[PDB]
Structures are given as C-alpha cells and as structure tokens.
Design a protein around this motif. Structure first.
Motif: not given
Ligand SMILES: CC(=O)S[C@@H]1CC2=CC(=O)CC[C@]2(C)[C@H]2CC[C@@]3(C)[C@@H](CC[C@@]34CCC(=O)O4)[C@H]12
Length: 431
Positions: A37, A39-40, A42, A80
């Motif tokens: 999460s 890291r990216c 969403w 991702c």
C-alpha cells in the motif's frame, strides 16, 4: 419507578449480543500488505480485491474470511495493478493458509468478535456467549427459588441485583474470553431472578394488567435505549459499561400425573420453547443478516410497542387461545416468506420482520396469561417454573442453530423457525 429501569437494563442482557457481539467484514491480516500500500496507495476496496481471496462461486465467504495467500509481499511486489496475476495464472493455484497473524475487522468500533477473535474456527464461541447466558438463566431460575427462603425475599433480591450490576461492570473489564463467559454465566444466574422478582413486586404490591404492560413497555424502552447507546457508543466495552452502570447506580410429579395436566404441561412447554426460540432466533438473524442493524432494531422495538396493545385489546374480546394460534401462525408464515425474499428487497424484508416480531410479541402476551390460568393454585408456581425452564432450554439451543445452520444454508434457520411456528400454531388449538 426503579423497576422500569430494571426492566430496561434486562433488555441488553438477553438481547445485547447483537450490538456487543457483531461480526465485521474480516480477512486474514497478511504482513507486507502495508508495504504494498505504501508502494502504491490503492483504495481499501482495491486492497480487498487484490489481497483477500475472492468469494466462492456459490456465495461461500469462508475462502476469503479465513484464508490468506502465501505469495511474498515484501519481495516480488513490482506489480501493483494485479500482483496475484504475475505470481500465478490461476488464483486457486496459490497456497491458502490460515489467519496465522490475526484478522482485520472493517468497522470503526469494537466488538466481542473483534476483541476476542471469535471468527472462523472460533465462530462457535460467539454462540457460547449466549448459550452461557441461557444456561445461567436456567440454573439461576432453580437456585434463586431454592435460596429465597434462606435469606428472605428482600436480602436475596438486593444481593442478586448487586451481583448482576457488579457482574456487568466487571464484564466491561474482562481480560479474556473465559472471564467473559464466567461473568455471562453469573449475570444469567442472577438476572432472570431479578426480572421475575421485579415483576412480582410490581404486580402484587400494587393490588395488575396495567402495571404488567407498563413493565413490558419498560423492556421495549430499554431495547430502544440499547439501540441508541450502541449507535452512540460503538465499542463493546463502552456499551457494556454504560448498560451496567444504570442498575448499579440505581412438586415435579404434580404436573405430569393425570393425562389432563400432562398434556397441558406438554403443550405449554412446547409453546414456551418454540416462541423463545423464535424470538431469540429472529433477533439473531437480524443481527447476522441485516445491513441496517440499528434502524432495523429500532423499527422492531417500535413494532413491539403496539403488539402489547393489540394483545391487550384481543384478550378482552377475542380470547386467549384463538389469538395465540393466529400470532404463532403469523410468526411462522413471516419466517417462511423471508426465505423467498430476494436479497435486493430490504423494505419488504423489514416489514415482514416487523410482522413476525409483532406476532411473537402477541403470542408471548397470551402465553403468560394462559400459563398462569391453566394450573391450579398449588401447582401454578411449579408449572410456570418448568415452562420457563423449557424456555431457557430453547434459549440455550437457539444460538447453536441460528449461527451454525447459516454456515450450511442461510435459509435453513428460517425454515426451522417456520416449521416450529406453524407446528406451535397448530398445537395451541388443543388447549
Ligand atoms: C427473549 C424472550 O424470550 S422475551 C424477553 C425475555 C424474558 C424472558 C422471561 O421469561 C422473563 C421476562 C422476559 C424479559 C420477557 C418479558 C416480556 C417481554 C418483554 C419479552 C419480550 C417480549 C415481551 C412480551 C411482549 C412485550 O411487550 O415484551 C421478554
């Protein structure tokens, strides 16, 4: 009228499991999901989509509510959009272990299920939570009757009320589930005696129907206040403490010998068992199925409100036996019809629940009077005690079917409730 407050405080004891023990949408707590999460970032819905295993083709949520994925999250997390697709072409090929590190519950508040982790293999412990209360109710109904003559009818009452309040308050501070269950057992032991003694004082001291119906109105007001407090106080510790604080701060063979009394005793025992099961199971089905728990509970209490008035009107004119059959058949038919309601409909679902709960209300109103009026002077107490004993047996049995048949078929508890309701409606015509 402290007796009305006692009735109000009894409502979250027998029923408050719906708001204390509610089951949030949980899943396995997989370490490394936070790293992904970060890291990216969403959305949480995307988190459940990409991490939690999907639901079964036949609506089986077990594979997602109690299983995780063995794919490493710290490493090989370059993808991702669909990290699981890169790991394996088929989602089922990935290993699915258990919730080793706990669960993540998707509610802002707290619950007994959330606190003590009564999910998956331990999901029957939430049933044990209510079964212990009802086993309490039974053993206390025996013990208080045994002990009333030992310390009088006032010192024993004060002691039982004190034990109820202290048990609830210490329940609000229970460290583990074993102490939780022990305090439930003690509270069940004392609380039924407290309610029955309060009813006896409010009936005999005044010198009848009006004070009784006001007593059930106090119970319904307690249910409404429980709904309001559960809305205001999400965490189960806060709700339990704020419910316990009010009340703290202030022969056996004589009913079965002759065929006449044996058959009547059988019928009354079955009626108590069936209607206790129906009432508690309907409440638990509401707790476990409705997505509008607060408003649904408020509506059902507000429909319990005129049920007593309808029963009082009918007993004056229609009678007692005839409206009992109609009310039991109404509850059974409502339970049967709820099976065929599509999940999309909610207004019809709550309307039919309200009709069923009104039927249960009216049925219990005539059950009390008929139980009182079908026994002689000397055996009336024994008959009422044994009938309430079977009521408590039904209360013990109810959670272990309501929350366990849904794991097999969500419409199976409703089928059993419908069968019980129609059978009771047919049976109560023999009195
Ligand atoms: C879970 C249940 O079985 S009912 C609930 C618990 C209970 C068991 C007893 O036998 C002792 C006393 C009680 C508290 C009942 C008291 C009367 C109640 C409040 C009933 C719910 C429906 C009824 C009749 C219609 C109305 O106006 O309220 C109470």
């Amino acid at each position: 009228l402290i007796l009305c407050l006692l009735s109000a405080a009894f409502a979250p004891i027998c029923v408050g499991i719906v708001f204390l023990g509610f089951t949030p949408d949980h899943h396995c707590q997989s370490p490394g999901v936070a790293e992904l999460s970060q890291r990216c970032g969403w959305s949480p819905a995307e988190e459940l989509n990409y991490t939690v295993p999907g639901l079964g083709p036949a609506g089986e949520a077990f594979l997602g509510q109690c299983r995780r994925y063995e794919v490493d999250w710290n490493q090989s997390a370059l993808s991702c959009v669909d990290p699981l697709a890169s790991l394996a072409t088929n989602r089922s090929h990935l290993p699915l272990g258990p919730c080793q590190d706990g669960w993540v519950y998707d509610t802002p508040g707290s619950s007994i299920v959330t606190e003590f982790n009564l999910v998956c293999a331990d999901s029957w412990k939430l049933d044990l939570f209510q079964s212990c209360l009802n086993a309490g109710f039974l053993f206390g109904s025996l013990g208080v009757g045994y002990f009333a003559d030992r310390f009088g009818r006032k010192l024993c009452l004060l002691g039982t009320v004190l034990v109820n309040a202290v048990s609830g308050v210490l329940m609000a501070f229970s460290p583990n589930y074993m102490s939780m269950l022990l305090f439930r057992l003690l509270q069940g032991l004392v609380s039924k005696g407290n309610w029955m003694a309060g009813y006896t004082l409010i009936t005999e001291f005044v010198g009848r129907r009006t004070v009784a119906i006001m007593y059930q109105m106090a119970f319904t007001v307690g249910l409404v206040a429980l709904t309001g407090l559960a809305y205001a106080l999400p965490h189960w510790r806060w709700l339990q403490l704020a419910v316990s604080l009010p009340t703290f701060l202030f022969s056996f063979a004589d009913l079965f010998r002759t065929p006449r009394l044996r058959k009547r005793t059988f019928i009354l025992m079955y009626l108590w068992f069936t209607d206790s099961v129906l009432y508690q199971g309907l409440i638990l089905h509401m707790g476990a199925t409705s997505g509008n728990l607060y408003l649904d509970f408020l509506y059902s209490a507000l429909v319990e409100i005129p049920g007593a008035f309808i029963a009082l009107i009918t007993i004056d004119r229609v009678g007692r036996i005839y409206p009992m059959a109609m009310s039991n058949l109404l509850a059974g038919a409502a339970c049967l019809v709820m099976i065929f309601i599509s999940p999309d409909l909610h207004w019809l679902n709550i309307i039919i629940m309200c009709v069923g709960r009104m039927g249960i209300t009216i049925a219990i109103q005539m059950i009390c009077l008929v139980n009182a009026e079908l026994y002689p002077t000397f055996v009336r107490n024994l008959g009422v005690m044994v009938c309430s004993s079977l009521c408590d047996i039904g209360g013990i049995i109810t959670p272990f079917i309501v929350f366990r048949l849904r794991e097999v078929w969500q419409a199976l508890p409703l089928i059993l409730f419908a069968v019980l309701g129609l059978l009771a409606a047919g049976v109560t015509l023999l009195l």
